Design a protein around this ligand. Structure first.
Ligand SMILES: O=c1[nH]c(=O)c2nn[nH]c2[nH]1
Ligand SMILES: O=c1[nH]c(=O)c2nn[nH]c2[nH]1
Ligand SMILES: O=c1[nH]c(=O)c2nn[nH]c2[nH]1
Ligand SMILES: O=c1[nH]c(=O)c2nn[nH]c2[nH]1
Ligand code: NA
Ligand code: NA
Ligand code: NA
Ligand code: NA
Lengths: 295, 295, 295, 295
């Protein structure tokens, strides 16, 4: 037998950092969960019980805290690139670092219509994520994403003209509820190293904001022919607005809300144009994915 | 042996309702999860296999949908009271109904600075809940609550002057992070029946909004001596602003963020006044509760 | 305003303990999650910011570890009683301690048909729990429970003869699937203090085992007329077998498995006697509860 | 812009099937959660709102139930292959089907030392899974796995001789607790189609059982030098026992249990050889992975 692939590291490292503006008194908080996995010439730890090649996962944890202490933690694309680069430069036998970061929302509170200097609210479980792969000699590959954005529209969604055969019971519809949890990922062109990532720093926050805005606007405004058609329109616009993105991927559950026929009860009318009360379905769910790239 | 207490019903009934303004075209959605448990002269279903006394839990489910079709679902205090009253009036042998409702947030989207007619976002997992107990001959008892409101302040929290003995290792502090998930419940004076609940309908939304606002403002502005002291100030203000509330209960986890001593690494200073990077602790957590009533 | 009720303490304290038999080399592990909440003359911490009355929740955490170090942790009824008694005896102004313990399964592995000295498996998420309330001058009240025991029988369950009215659509049935997650609690007669709890130590494990066995046997063997009727038979037997129990409470979800009519597809027969494939329903669910005591 | 990749289908389809032996009266239940995603010439549904190419996800759901009605559902490797093959044969424009199945445990109850004909228990959340990719013209690729197997050993684990530098604080140890949740996947050689999968049917259950047994025995018996070294021994043995497996992958969290120094309290000794009470850590956790193949 032989080791074909191996990676190891520390997962679920929770980190909080505060920045204190000494002039204005304003404080800003960041909280993240970080995973770092390393690859390299480490096969002998598996095959010969040779621990000399192992950077202990506990040391990886320490490194994450030290790196957060000494560097900015935002945008997460930059922090992940610094962290990944550290490992491949520091350790001769480590040749790739894989860094995943999940950013948790801490939104500044408005009290009496003014922004509070040091109090925050978690407004929603929506996350901003990054995956950074730093590979010695092959640069830095960054995938950025948003996830956990849950939306619903109560009309202006249709689904008709699909294939009908002996397996089909679904009725065509010209008016339905559409609800989904949005997972959207944009993949950056490969960067040659940390200098290049630093040169593009302002684009990271701006592109996240654009991706979010395009998603929300398109969802709200599209008279949707299907999840497939609407998601394609989103990806198209993101690619048009940021030339440094190579691909955009969307993965969307279709969370069903079923009509409830109440006509058995005193002829109560609750279907089609008369539908007011629906039963949200926890499962099953449609799952629709697409990756869109440049011509 | 004897049946000392018994209740039964349907849990986790998900309900969505849409309202369509025909004039303006604006649509408004409500989504809830409902539980209804009944009590009454039902002992023989347990002791003698006498199903004749059982209103099937499936029928309870149907009733919830029918009641939602025929009545407003907001404020949830009113809907729960209508639903509970139904069971005790319809069935001679049922003498109490216990209705729990969890309201899920669907917040209207703003697209280009204007409110969208039919698109919504789940902004946070914060819930608005009610527990309504309708007891034949004893009226309607309503407890209203908010839960899942997660906040953090990065300074202006202290904790010193606590009991120190041979079990104590905790250092006194004059500056710490305070973070919690807020669960707050206000209990209404008993209502004589549905007419009285209807007469107070405008107070329900207003008091929820007041409870939320008082919680957020007090948390943000109090130079907190302890969780205990800050939560008491919240409850005091709510009771002052709504005379129809008898008690306010808060249950608050104290979610710890620990300093990380990095001095072992090149004398790096990250504690006390120099603390910038902290480790959020998933467990254990403080749990602090208080019920405040009138003198 | 006045403090009507208050309690505070530490939740989610995870504890592991190992016992090493020096003779045989056999090791036995216990893992628990513990919550301790205290009550007493602590109102001024809420109303006057007087921290002098507060035993810090961090000290409560330390106490749990120290108590585990110096005492047996099994049966959990004994450990909880020792822990609760500690607080009311040590601190003059603390008059009640509320201890909840959840015991996690670590079952000794059998390797090649022999019990391994030091390797364990988590066989199921079933828990054994205790709630111990130690109240100064009123003794020790103990509720013991099992929870998270999930069972299914594929036949020998019926449900017919229930009330039918204009809200009813459910068909009567003489053969259905019955599946539930069992939560069963037995409440001990009040104990005068720790000496009395110690005198009954062997009864705690034995009664847990009896409760489990009675639950499983009755579920498997009863030709069930309803969840109500079957659960009553369980509680009756437990009370008969242990005179020191005052009440038994069961809380049982009815997890529905629905027939799927496939007759629309080539006349495929999959209902009634021909039912083979079913759709488990995640929600809603029946919820049936009963508390049974002595005549 | 262009569609670079696309797949869509139905996730979280819960299925139960019962088999009734008419002779013996014995019933056997299977419960699974199924996901089917399709690929093919479906780009126009995204780019041109052309729904004519879409097999509705609701029809995919129907197909899963119909296929379960007409075929055995065990071993899951066979069921997944039948289900995937169906889609590529039935629909000319669909060229790949991706089927994921999670099998849930329903273990026959023993009542009074005999196997019950129709009552079952969920003994643990351990799952048996399959991923089947059926690609037109390229055969059937099957990955089988077990997951959610949680184990702990209280001694006979060591970790010393790892790299030490200015980032290292971890002490070497010759005796520690080792606990993990096992995720193990074995990948079968490519099969040419359903006939070939059918010819190997007996190997699927046998290899699952072997993988499980090897995992448990090796974990219990290895005087472990590291997670890396122990997991390699497991994978080596599985590959040796089943020639039709090409690779074995393990992904193992290292769930830490920390010593608690209690010496601050009356010189209490609870570290090194005197360690009895430990604090399980919910996070962070080590994560160690390896893929082992043939020389
Ligand atoms: O078994 C281990 N492997 C590792 O890589 C490691 N790192 N810290 N502790 C560890 N234990
Ligand atoms: O066992 C049951 N008890 C009930 O109360 C009920 N209601 N619907 N189905 C049911 N099954
Ligand atoms: O606000 C606090 N209240 C408490 O009771 C406590 N105990 N430890 N830390 C604490 N912080
Ligand atoms: O938008 C949709 N896309 C689909 O592929 C589908 N299938 N059923 N319903 C559907 N809705
Ligand atoms: Na390197
Ligand atoms: Na009545
Ligand atoms: Na006392
Ligand atoms: Na095909």
């Amino acid at each position: 037998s032989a080791v074909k692939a191996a990676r190891y590291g520390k997962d679920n490292v929770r980190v909080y950092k505060v920045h204190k503006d000494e002039k204005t008194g304003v404080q800003t908080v960041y909280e993240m969960t970080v995973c770092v996995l390393l690859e390299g010439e480490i096969e002998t730890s598996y095959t010969k019980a040779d621990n000399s090649v192992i950077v202990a996962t506990d040391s990886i944890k320490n490194t994450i805290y030290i790196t957060a202490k000494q560097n900015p933690v935002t945008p997460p694309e930059l922090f992940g690139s610094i962290l990944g680069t550290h490992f491949i430069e520091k350790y001769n036998h480590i040749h790739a670092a894989h860094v995943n970061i999940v950013c948790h929302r801490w939104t500044r509170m408005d009290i009496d219509g003014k922004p509070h200097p040091h109090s925050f609210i978690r407004d929603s479980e929506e996350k901003r994520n990054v995956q950074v792969d730093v590979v010695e000699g092959k640069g830095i590959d960054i995938k950025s994403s948003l996830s956990g954005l849950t939306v619903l529209k109560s009309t202006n969604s249709q689904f008709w003209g699909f294939l009908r055969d002996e397996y089909t019971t679904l009725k065509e519809t010209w008016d339905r509820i559409l609800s989904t949890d949005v997972d959207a990922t944009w993949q950056w062109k490969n960067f040659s190293g940390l200098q290049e990532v630093r040169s593009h720093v302002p684009k990271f926050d701006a592109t996240w904001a654009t991706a979010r805005e395009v998603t929300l606007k398109t969802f709200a405004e599209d008279n949707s022919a299907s999840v497939q058609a609407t998601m394609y329109k989103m990806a198209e616009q993101i690619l048009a607005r940021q030339q440094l993105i190579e691909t955009v991927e969307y993965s969307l559950p279709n969370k069903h809300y079923f009509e409830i026929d109440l006509s058995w009860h005193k002829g109560l009318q609750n279907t089609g144009k008369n539908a007011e009360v629906f039963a949200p379905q926890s499962d099953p769910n449609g799952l629709i994915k697409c990756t869109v790239g440049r011509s």
